[PDB]
Design brief:
globular, 7 helices, 2 domains, transcription, two-stranded antiparallel sheet, mainly alpha, 3% strand, binds zinc ion, Histone Acetyltransferase, Chain A
Amino acid sequence: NSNICEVCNKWGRLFCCDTCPRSFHEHCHIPSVEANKNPWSCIFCRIKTIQERCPESQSGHQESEVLMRQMLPEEQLKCEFLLLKVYCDSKSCFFASEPYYNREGSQGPQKPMWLNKVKTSLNEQMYTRVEGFVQDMRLIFHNHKEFYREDKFTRLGIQVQDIFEKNFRNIFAIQETS
Ligand SMILES: [Zn+2]
Ligand SMILES: [Zn+2]
Ligand SMILES: [Zn+2]
């Protein structure tokens, strides 16, 4: 196994996957690393199994159909993995915890949103469709763009949103376009 967490790239108290060489901090893995279960298989492994059991699941999809899917177990897992892929980027630090807004010339968003809040919402099964999860994720970056206006710090929103969108298109096998 790796000697650093796959998500945050730090050492510490790691749990090791039994079916691949990745390791995780307890609360870096999503869902949080399960108490027992020997062998234990990480989210990367579980996602690969879905694809292997149904190879046609990689054929192209329309985003509009993906968003209307109910959050059954497989869609729940895919959203968890997409959330995890965002946390994997170190720039996710800026969007993880509850923000506050006091900048001359700007007003805070009407509906603040942050990664840990999405994490809790997934954990508590608060989303009934994929659309719920994707809307909250995109709201994080949209709030950031609007608040920071012409400050160059707006670019962090652009950057982390691009990670989100690339991973959304990969995980849900969105039909490639020009
Ligand atoms: Zn970690
Ligand atoms: Zn694994
Ligand atoms: Zn099949």
